[PDB]
Structure formats: C-alpha cells, structure tokens
Design an enzyme around this catalytic site. Sequence first.
Site, PDB file in Angstrom:
ATOM      1  N   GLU D  48      64.518  54.508  47.052  1.00  0.00           N
ATOM      2  CA  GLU D  48      63.298  53.981  47.645  1.00  0.00           C
ATOM      3  C   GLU D  48      63.826  53.367  48.933  1.00  0.00           C
ATOM      4  OE1 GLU D  48      61.261  50.313  46.337  1.00  0.00           O
ATOM      5  OE2 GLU D  48      59.470  51.566  46.111  1.00  0.00           O
ATOM      6  N   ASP D  59      56.850  41.399  51.216  1.00  0.00           N
ATOM      7  CA  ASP D  59      58.243  41.186  50.851  1.00  0.00           C
ATOM      8  C   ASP D  59      58.693  39.734  50.893  1.00  0.00           C
ATOM      9  OD1 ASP D  59      59.521  43.899  50.360  1.00  0.00           O
ATOM     10  OD2 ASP D  59      58.557  44.258  52.306  1.00  0.00           O
ATOM     11  N   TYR D 174      54.173  52.969  40.011  1.00  0.00           N
ATOM     12  CA  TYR D 174      54.942  51.756  40.253  1.00  0.00           C
ATOM     13  C   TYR D 174      54.359  50.628  39.417  1.00  0.00           C
ATOM     14  CZ  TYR D 174      57.981  48.571  42.887  1.00  0.00           C
ATOM     15  OH  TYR D 174      58.960  47.676  43.257  1.00  0.00           O
TER      16      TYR D 174
HETATM   17  O1  F6F Z   1      60.189  48.030  45.735  1.00  0.00           O
HETATM   18  C1  F6F Z   1      59.988  47.224  46.646  1.00  0.00           C
HETATM   19  N1  F6F Z   1      60.305  45.920  46.401  1.00  0.00           N
HETATM   20  C2  F6F Z   1      61.674  45.440  46.619  1.00  0.00           C
HETATM   21  C3  F6F Z   1      61.751  43.963  46.268  1.00  0.00           C
HETATM   22  O2  F6F Z   1      62.893  43.716  45.555  1.00  0.00           O
HETATM   23  P1  F6F Z   1      62.591  43.642  43.948  1.00  0.00           P
HETATM   24  O3  F6F Z   1      62.204  42.194  43.753  1.00  0.00           O
HETATM   25  O4  F6F Z   1      63.876  43.907  43.195  1.00  0.00           O
HETATM   26  O5  F6F Z   1      61.603  44.750  43.655  1.00  0.00           O
HETATM   27  C4  F6F Z   1      58.525  46.992  47.060  1.00  0.00           C
HETATM   28  C5  F6F Z   1      57.472  47.715  46.379  1.00  0.00           C
HETATM   29  C6  F6F Z   1      56.096  47.519  46.750  1.00  0.00           C
HETATM   30  C7  F6F Z   1      55.750  46.601  47.809  1.00  0.00           C
HETATM   31  O6  F6F Z   1      54.462  46.363  48.225  1.00  0.00           O
HETATM   32  C8  F6F Z   1      53.771  45.380  47.461  1.00  0.00           C
HETATM   33  F1  F6F Z   1      54.378  44.202  47.512  1.00  0.00           F
HETATM   34  F2  F6F Z   1      52.538  45.225  47.919  1.00  0.00           F
HETATM   35  F3  F6F Z   1      53.683  45.728  46.186  1.00  0.00           F
HETATM   36  C9  F6F Z   1      56.797  45.873  48.498  1.00  0.00           C
HETATM   37  C10 F6F Z   1      58.181  46.069  48.126  1.00  0.00           C
END
Ligand code: F6F
Lengths: 392, 392, 251, 251
Positions: D48, D59, D174
């Site tokens: 990813e 984030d 997801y």
């Molecule tokens: O996979 C990604 N996340 C990485 C963050 O690290 P972790 O805490 O291990 O998932 C990730 C997946 C979806 C995303 O959008 C939202 F927040 F709206 F869902 C943002 C980051």
Amino acid sequence: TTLLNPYFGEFGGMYVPQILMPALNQLEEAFVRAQKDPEFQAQFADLLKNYAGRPTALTKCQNITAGTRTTLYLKREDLLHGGAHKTNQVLGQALLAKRMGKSEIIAETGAGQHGVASALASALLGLKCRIYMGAKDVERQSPNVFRMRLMGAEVIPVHSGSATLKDACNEALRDWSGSYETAHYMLGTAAGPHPYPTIVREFQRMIGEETKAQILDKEGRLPDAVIACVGGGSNAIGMFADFINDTSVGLIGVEPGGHGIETGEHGAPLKHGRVGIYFGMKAPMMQTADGQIEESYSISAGLDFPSVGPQHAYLNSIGRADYVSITDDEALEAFKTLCRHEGIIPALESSHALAHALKMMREQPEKEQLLVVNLSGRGDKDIFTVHDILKA
Amino acid sequence: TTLLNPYFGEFGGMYVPQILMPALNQLEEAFVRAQKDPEFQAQFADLLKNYAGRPTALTKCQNITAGTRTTLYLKREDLLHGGAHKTNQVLGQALLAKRMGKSEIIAETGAGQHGVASALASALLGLKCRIYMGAKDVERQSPNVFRMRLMGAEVIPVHSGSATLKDACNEALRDWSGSYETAHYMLGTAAGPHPYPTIVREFQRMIGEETKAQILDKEGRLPDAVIACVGGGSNAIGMFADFINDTSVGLIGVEPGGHGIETGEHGAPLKHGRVGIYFGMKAPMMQTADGQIEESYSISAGLDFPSVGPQHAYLNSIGRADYVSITDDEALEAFKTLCRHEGIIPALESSHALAHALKMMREQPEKEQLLVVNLSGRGDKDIFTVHDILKA
Amino acid sequence: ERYENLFAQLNDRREGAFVPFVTLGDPGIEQSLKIIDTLIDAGADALELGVPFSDPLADGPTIQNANLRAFAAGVTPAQCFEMLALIREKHPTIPIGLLMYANLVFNNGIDAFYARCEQVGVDSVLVADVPVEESAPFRQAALRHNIAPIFICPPNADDDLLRQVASYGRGYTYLLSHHLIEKLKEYHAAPALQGFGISSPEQVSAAVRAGAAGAISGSAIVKIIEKNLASPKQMLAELRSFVSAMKAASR
Amino acid sequence: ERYENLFAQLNDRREGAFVPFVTLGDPGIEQSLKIIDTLIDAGADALELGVPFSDPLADGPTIQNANLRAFAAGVTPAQCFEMLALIREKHPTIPIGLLMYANLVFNNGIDAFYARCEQVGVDSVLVADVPVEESAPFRQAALRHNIAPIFICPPNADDDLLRQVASYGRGYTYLLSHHLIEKLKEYHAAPALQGFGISSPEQVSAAVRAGAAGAISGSAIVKIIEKNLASPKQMLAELRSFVSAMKAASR
Ligand SMILES: O=C(NCCOP(=O)(O)O)c1ccc(OC(F)(F)F)cc1
Ligand SMILES: Cc1ncc(COP(=O)(O)O)c(CN[C@@H](CO)C(=O)O)c1O
Ligand SMILES: Cc1ncc(COP(=O)(O)O)c(CN[C@@H](CO)C(=O)O)c1O
Ligand SMILES: O=C(NCCOP(=O)(O)O)c1ccc(OC(F)(F)F)cc1
Ligand code: NA
Ligand code: NA
C-alpha cells in the site's frame, strides 16, 4: 446669573477665569435651547440609534450568580460604537458645538477612550478636533493615540505638571479661554464648571432610561440597586439619573481603591478626599495637606480623574447614593470572572463596578437581590495590561 | 443519503473519511429538527438580541459619497458582541451542540476572530472549547490567543504543513473523527462538508434579513447591490441569502487580490483558482498544477481560507452573483478613508468590500446607485498592522 | 491703604505705576528674596507675587515653568507667607498683592487665608479662578481683613460686569489687555492697571495715556529669571535694567 | 487480478496476508525504492503506497511526517508514477495499492488518473476522503481501467453500509480496527484486510483468527524509517526484521 442652578448643594459652581464665563454662559443657553428643540432631539436620537447602535442590550448574567439569590444584569455600553459609554454624550456635545456655529473641538483624555469618542464624532460631523493628553498617558496609550490620528484628530502631548489627565484638563481650559469664539471644549465627564455636569448627565441619561424600560420588561420591577464605577462620574450619573426619584432603587458608585485606601495610592476622593476648588468646581479631591492637587492611582487608566462630579458629592451628602471602593486586585478578579463565565471582556474601569456587585452577592449569598451593573466599556484595550500582570 | 441537498450545482458534497459520515448525518438531522423547533428559535433569538446585541445598525455614510450619485449604507456587524459577524452562527452552532448532547467544542481559526467567538460562546453556554490554530497564526495573533484563553478555551498550535489555517482545518477534522461522540466541530465559515455550508448560511441569514427590513424602512426600496468580502464566504452569504430571490438586487462578493492577481500572491480562488476537492468539499481552490493545496495571501488575516464556499461558486456559475477582487493597497485606502470620513474603523477584511463600493462610485460618479456594504467587523485588531505599514 | 496712598502720590507726580510680577520662591527662596529687593530698588511701585500651585490653568508656559522651578525648590504656601512677612518688614509702604488659585485660599478656610494675609502685611489678593459670579465669600473675607479683592475686567466684558467690578473691587482694577477705562472711572472703580502682554516701555506709556493708572508686567520679568538661572548676579543686573526702563516710561 | 490470485494462493496455504504501507519518496526516491524492495524481499504479500499530499487530514503524526520528508525531497505525483512503473517492472505479481487523497485523483481528471494507474501496473486505489456516498465517479473510473476501488468499512458502520461496501468494493475490503467480517462474507464482499493500529505479530495472528484475510501495517513501518534516517543500512536491516516477524505471524 444663569438659567440653571450651577450647584448641587454646596458642590459645583463655575470657578473659572472671568475670561471664560461668556463661553460657559453661551454653552448653557445653547444647551437649554437644544433641550426644547424637537429637531435637535431628533438628530441626536438618529445618531445614537443608526450610528452608535442604541439601544444597547441588558444582559442577564446567569452563570456568575449560580448558587446565590442574586440576579445580575449588565447594561451593555461595551457594545456601543467606540467601545464605551463616552460616545453618547460626545455626539450630543458635537451637535451643540454645531448649533453654536463652532467648527473646532477641544477635548481632554487620560485613558484615551473619550479622546477616541471625540475624534470619531468630529470625523462624522465635520469638526476639526484637537485633543490634549498628558505626555505620560500618551506614552502608555499609543493605540488610542493612533486611532485618534487615524480619524483625523490632532493629539497634543502635555508635558506640564505631572503630565497626566489633570494637566491635560488645564491645557484644554487655557486653549479654550482664547478660542471659545470658534472652538468648543468637549469635556469628557460629569465634572468641571457648570453647565458641564448637567449637560453630560443629560446626554448620558439614556443609559438609565433604557435600563429602567428593559428591567421592567424582563423582571416586571425596578432593580434593588444599580451599580457603576466612578472616575469623573459620567457613566454612573447616566445610569443613576432616571432612578433618582425611585427611592427604592439603591444607587451605588464605585471609586478605585488602587493598592488599598490605607496605602494612600487610590482614586477615591469622594469618600477619602477633602473638598476643594479645582477644574472649575467645588468638589472633593485628591490633594495634599497644603492644597496642591494630586493624581488618582488605579490599575484602570479611566478612573484617573483626581476629583469627582459635584452631583455625586451631593447625592452622597444627602444619603441618596452610596459610594464604596474596589481595589486593583478585586477589579482584576472580576475581570477574569466575567471573561471565563459570561464570555464578556469588561473594561478594567467597569470591572470595579462588577467587583462590588460580586461582593454584595458573595457576602450575603441568601439575600434576594436584583442588581444591574453598568458595563461602561469593553476591555479589549486592557488585555495587555492584564496579561503583563498575570504573567508577572 | 441526506435530508438536504449537499450540492449547489457541481459544488459541495461530503468529501470526508467514511469514519466522519455519521457525525455529519447526525449534525444535519439535528439542524433540520432545530430549524422547525420554536423553542430552539426562541433561544437563539434571545441570545442574539440580549447577549450579542442584534439587530445591528444600518448606517448611512453621507461624507464618503459626497459629490456622487451613490448612496452607501454599512450593515454594522462591527457592533456585534465580539467585533464581527462570526458571533451570530457560533451561538447557533453552540445551541446545536447542546441539542445533540455534546459537551465539547472543536474550532479552527486563522485570524482568531472565529476562535474568539467560539470561546465566548463556549464560556456562556458551558462548553469545553478546544481551538486549533496554525502555529504561524498563533505567533502573529497573540492578542486573540490570550482572549481565547481568558475565556477558558484551550488553544492548540498546529505545526504541520504550512502551519496556517488549512492545516488547522485538517487537525480539527482528525480530532473530530475520533471524538464526534462527545464533541462538536464548530466550523467557522460557509464551507467544508455538507451540512456546514447550509448551516452557516442559515445561522448568518439575519444579516441580510435585517438589512432588507432596514433599507426598505429608510429608502423605501431594495438596494441596487449588496457587497461583501469573501474569505470562506459566511458573512457574504449571510448578507446575500435573503436577496437571492430579489433578482433586481446585485450580489457582489470581493476576494482578496493581495499584491495583485498577476503576482500570484492573492486569495481569489473563485475567479482565479481551479476546482478541486479538499476540506470535505468540491470547490475552487488555491492549488499547484500538481494538485497540492496552497495558502491564500492577503494583508487581511481573515481572508486566508484557501478555497471558497460552494454556494458562492454556484451563484457565480449561473450568473446570480458577481465576484471581483481588491488589492492590499485598495483595502488600505478604504480603511483610512472610512476612519477619517465616517469615524468608523473597519476590519481589513471588510475594507475589501468597502474598497469595491468606493470603486463603483468613483468610476461612474454620476451613476445613481443605492449600495449596501457588509461591515463584517471592526478594525481595532488591525491598528498595529496599518501602523507598521504607513510608518514604513 | 497702601494702594490708596500710592496712587494719590503718583497722581501728584503725574506718573503711572509699574507693577512687576514674579513667582515666590522662584528659582529659590534666597534668590527670590533678592530678586524682589532688586525689583523694588529698580523702581517697582508695587508687587504682584504668585504662590506656587500645582495646576496654574490661567498661566502661559513662562509662568508655568516659574512654578515648576519653585516646586523644584520645595517652596510651599507656609514658606511663602514667611517670605511675605520678611518682605513687608523690610519695605513698609510698597503695595504687595498676591495672585492666588482658589484651592490655596479655600484649603484651610477662606477667612483664615485673608486673616493670614493681613497679619503678614499683604495689601490685595487676586484669585485667578474665581469670577465675580463666585466671589462673594472671597471679597467679603478680604474686606473683613482689610485686604483689597482684585477683579479682572476682561476685554470681552459688558456694562453689567463693569458695574460689578467697579463696586466689588478695591485697590486697583485688573484691566486685561480705553473705552472700558472711561466706564470704570464713571462708576468710581478702583484705579485701573493694565496687565497681560506688557513687555516694553512703550506699552507702559501707552497704558498711562489711555487713562490707566499703570501697568503690570510678569512673563517678561520671569523670562529674565529663567534665561539667567546659571548667573545669579547677571540675573539681578538684567532685572534692574528692565524695571528701570519700564518704570521710566511711566513718568 | 493480482489480489484475486494472491488470496487464492494464500488460501491454499491457510495463511493470511501481511501488507505494509509506506509513503512514496520517503525519505527519498532512491532510499524509498530500496525500502520497498526490502519490504518485498522480507515477506510482504502486497503493498500500500501513499502519494505525498499537502494536507493528509486522515493521517496521524507519523505519516504526516513521512509526507513532510517526501516533500523535503521534492517528490511529486509524476515521479511517484515513474517509481510505480519501475516497481512493477521488477515485481510482476505483488499487488500494489495506492492510498490517495481526492484532489490528486480529481486534479487532471478522474478517468485519466485511473488510466495512468492501469498503465504503470497499479492494482487498487483507496481514496481517503471519498466516502461510499461520493464514490460513484471514482469506482466507475476504477472499474473501467481494471483497478480495484478500495472502501473502508468503519467499526461504527451498519448493515446498509456493509451492503454498499460489499457490492462496490474490489480487491479487498479495508476493515478499520469479527461480526463485521462475517457480514462481509455473507454479502460476498472482497476479502477483508484489517488496518489501523496493527504494530505487533500477535495482532496479525489475531486478525487472521477473527476471519480476516490479512492485516495492513503502516505507522509501525514508517516509524522504523524515521528512527534510522541517519543510518540507511540499519533502516533496511530493521525493516527486514519487522516485516519477517509480521509475515511469520500470518502463517
Ligand atoms: O493504511 C493507511 N494507514 C496507515 C496508518 O498507519 P496504521 O496506523 O498502521 O494503519 C491508511 C488507510 C486509509 C486512510 O484514510 C482514512 F483515514 F480515511 F481511512 C488513511 C491511511
Ligand atoms: C470604559 C470607561 N469606563 C469608566 C470611565 C470613567 O469615567 P466616568 O466616571 O466619567 O464615567 C472611563 C473614562 N475615561 C477617561 C479618563 O481617562 C478618558 O479620557 O478616556 C472609560 O473609558
Ligand atoms: C471581520 C471578518 N470579516 C471577514 C472574514 C472572512 O470570512 P467569511 O468569508 O467567512 O465571512 C473574517 C474571517 N476570519 C477567519 C479566518 O481567519 C477566522 O478564523 O477568525 C473576519 O474575522
Ligand atoms: O498678572 C499675572 N499675569 C502674569 C502673566 O505675565 P503677563 O503676560 O506679563 O501678564 C496674572 C493675572 C491674572 C491671572 O488669572 C487669570 F488668568 F485668570 F486672569 C493669571 C496671571
Ligand atoms: Na475620581
Ligand atoms: Na478564500
């Protein structure tokens, strides 16, 4: 001779050089005529409503009185254009100046609030505004000095004497003595020589008139007491006036106690000074044992007039009004409390009035009482001062 | 699905993480119910009148239009408690938060005006207020930061990104995504995801409603045009709303031109940006050719939102409203002119709207036109900035 | 009494009176006493002396500074009265008038103030901020203690005021800087002395020709003091030359 | 297609998938390409990858800084696509998914974005700020270019949403960090991969036991990068050890 009584009991009068008497007599006559002129009243009302923003709200402060039997309302002069009650009477005096055919304005100011009011009124009404300010006050009121200049007024620093308000007052008088022909002296408080104490009261009377109408509408009865700070006495007499004949309504004026009455560093001449003759009037004043005029100390710049309006001295003498004092620290606590519990930032001057209302409530929590505090102005101007203090 | 249309033509929507949709849906439902609840309306009206000071005056500015056939009125939101129009809708949103059973408030602010409004409303209504502000804005808005803290709000500096408004906006959203259960995000402008553009407009609509009633009373007819500055779009849509169906009334929004549109240093995304998707909405924005979000430059801190409300983009597209820009220098001239000729110190934001009205008048002096400028706020907060500039 | 004798004697000599003004204690007690003796030895027919006050709202810059200098010296009203007693003990006939501000007279009681004036030998008192309209208590106390209450006849006055000043005033009428002079005489007013702006010999001759009994000069005198602060001797020398010149013009 | 083959192969081995997340270009193009190759060599079943964006409002701090570091390196979307092409040319079967912010997809046209994804070899795209409610244009463009549109199944969801995510999603669902996992399977939803907060091997085993097809880990991965910025080699070494551990737990 005069058209109206220059005295309130033993207090008041016209103690000015012979040269200035014609100016005072002219002003009194113009005022009397203006008061009976529907056209003048209509114009004054128009400016107050559509330019200044009257009527101002009467806010019930429910959070601060929780747990007590005190109901407290705040007359919101802080919402008036300019940020303080000073605007009311400057608009009236400016119209009077025009009625007399004068094109220039002379004003004195300590904190700068009346100076800003004089400047804005002069800008609106096409008057050439000249403002005298003690050099010491100019130094600590740079913001207000800039506002005055931004609005086209000429700010003149006075280095004579202690270089404060009283000295600015003297300078204004000496200027007016030789220019009264074309200029009007817009005194900023309910003091000085007759007819000023009377004119200022009448041009500030709407504060109390509105409060009475609003409290009757909201509570169905008159307040048990109305409370206001007293520097020169204008916002307080403006609130008191319409209630004087309502014997059941207490009138409480609050003088600045500074570091404490016993320290000598205060601004409470009415209850802790001695009667004297200065600034054109016979009234209680801050003076040495020899008779030299002294300054009034207070954390609030606006409660710096070293004397007090003659009508307040009179109302005190006959027992119609009661006067008390509030210290710098008590005012500061009231300032912080209103900010945190009602979301209103009060002027440090007004904070003295609020502090006394809070004392009345706190000292006798189960005493049922309806109180109105005159919130003479907003305290955005005091933010830095309060910051420096708390940070210290 | 939603109760109300999230779009204004192609603009608007709810572009937020799936996690935040329940919060938006809850808010929309609460808003719709509140709008049909006489009790909610009564409470909101009570606060606006007795706490905030509504209605605000509609001032005729006679000196500035001398020698021309332009009649100009200023809607005085500068006289509202807090010093700006921001207070209107925060009171409504605060009541909505309480209606939903929320005890905490999250707010974003750039200039600090909405932050102060959020803080005062939270102090009055017993809400725990948390405010996010770009670290860069915190540094240049120490006064407002202190006012917020004085009123009990927690100010949180945001160092991420450019450390400005857009970054504060992101931080507010990320916080709300995991706290919407107990906290309400009080967005400060008519932008962001549905239902915010709609809610803010409805909670600011009294500006235009009052203006219509006041202009009909004073002139016996509707304005030829109403003019307002556009940062995010709240004060402008608040003024425009009640006039949208009055086809003869022009709606003119003024974006900041900064150093000039051709310099690239401006804040006029509606007419000089490109449509994009950010901050939960599809709207025109300040963005690079690659699609990265940029900042809006303007001498006025309040016109810093890098995008614009979707309803403004829509009104522009169909030709109902016209949008223009005013430069830093044009705004500064308008600021100085109002101070000197009307005795009113306008916010630098509002000065952009005034500057355009002055242009309309000056460019065609003999064109008969009745104009209303929305004076969104007072400029006491800009005194230092203007000073540093003129002195320079 | 001293003003009466002075004007009678000056009339028999067909000459006007020259009256200088100075602030008591300026720039110091010792130097002030010397200044005063010089003014008298130079030709002064009478003296007008000011008591240092915190807010002299009737004085221009020159005198404002005289008071400032006096205060810097620690001069007080009590000390001013001690000086006055001494001055009278040295000069028995010269008329001595005080220029006062109302609060200094009102402070410990109006009657008490005039009583003190009488005991030290003062002849008149002009209270700057007390118009005829507020003068009752003051002129009554003055008269009870054989002190002449001095009134200011402004240029922007009228018949009514002229009649009041004529009946209430004693010693001399303070004529602010012709037709008024005639009216005063018509109403049996105290001899007129012109003041304010008198700084040259020609002005003194002019006043006497207009019909005034004399002229008063202060700022011009005070300016000599302030411009010779570092030269005590030169100060006196200059003072003598100025007064002699101004006095000569009254003959 | 690659997700389909991967899960089928992982099912025949009774093992879950471990999918790490990293920001493209962090801390630099060269090092990022090396980081990615290490993650793959260590055991990553899929990737990813995030495209640096100015305002990642979805984030936390860790990833916010990853983007900051990427921008400090001058990383742009165009360069990210060049990197993606290279990564695919080196690894033909590993599923590659992008984590995007709506404006980067909308910027030059939604259809054009997905078309570019297809040409470089991307398998899926998750647009962080596009809820199912606003997804139409995006999933339609994704499907037209054989790209799997990834949807987030939040924990605070309901039946309605579950049905939507199941019918609109492709590649994998997801699952934000049981009962939902069962519902998804009931509705023929794309295999579920749990994300958010996964930083330990036990969490990976837990996800697989709950019925999830695997787990996604990002912040934990990014933290290793930021804590070894000055040690490129050590960074890779640590990354390998972490991924191998997390991967082992999926078996
Ligand atoms: O996979 C990604 N996340 C990485 C963050 O690290 P972790 O805490 O291990 O998932 C990730 C997946 C979806 C995303 O959008 C939202 F927040 F709206 F869902 C943002 C980051
Ligand atoms: C908000 C507020 N409240 C109270 C006062 C005190 O004056 P008052 O007693 O006349 O009402 C002032 C005075 N201000 C005077 C003296 O410094 C001025 O020249 O601006 C004020 O500004
Ligand atoms: C007086 C005044 N007039 C206009 C605006 C612009 O916003 P609007 O377009 O939403 O009306 C602002 C905004 N102020 C925002 C952005 O910095 C704040 O966070 O305080 C203002 O304070
Ligand atoms: O005699 C005194 N003046 C000295 C000033 O110097 P000069 O200009 O020469 O008279 C003098 C006389 C009267 C007075 O009060 C008031 F101003 F009200 F009339 C003040 C000063
Ligand atoms: Na006082
Ligand atoms: Na904008």
